[PDB]
């Protein structure tokens with residue numbers, strides 16, 4: 001749906017990691033009212049439907065649960081994490097941190113292209129993939 005599911009506890013995140021099968025699990029750690037989160041959530045919402053065969057997207061409330069925030073070394077929101085069949089996926093964006101995407105995507109198409117790459121690699125058994133996004137479009141922060 002356009003109004004993506006919210007996860008508000010550790011147990012709910014645990015469960016989404018386990019329950020999302022054969023698709024990229026997208027976990028957006030943020031706050032729904034935060035300006036950069038608003039930007040990113042618009043892209044996640046608007047692309048969710050046409051990505052529905054490849055990805056399941058969730059909005060994770062960092063103000064109601066924080067176990068995972070420490071686990072992924074999240075200092076800035078939004079931070080977006082990718083999983084496939086229960087295992088964390090890394091992506092090389094051209095920055096040192098491959099474990100999470102920090103900030104918002106420049107365009108819808110960048111997110112789409114990224115998911116395509118993650119999905120294909122994950123389906124081939126890979127755990128780390130190369131981002132297809134032009135570095136000029138990667139938030140620098």
Ligand SMILES: OC[C@H]1O[C@@](CO)(O[C@H]2O[C@H](CO)[C@@H](O)[C@H](O)[C@H]2O)[C@@H](O)[C@@H]1O
Nearest residue numbers: 090091092093094095096097098099128
């Ligand atoms: O240890 C350096 C060696 O690691 C590779 C991945 O095998 O890339 C990593 O190190 C680069 C240089 O520090 C980083 O820019 C990159 O993000 C990181 O994955 C090699 O390409 C590199 O030679």
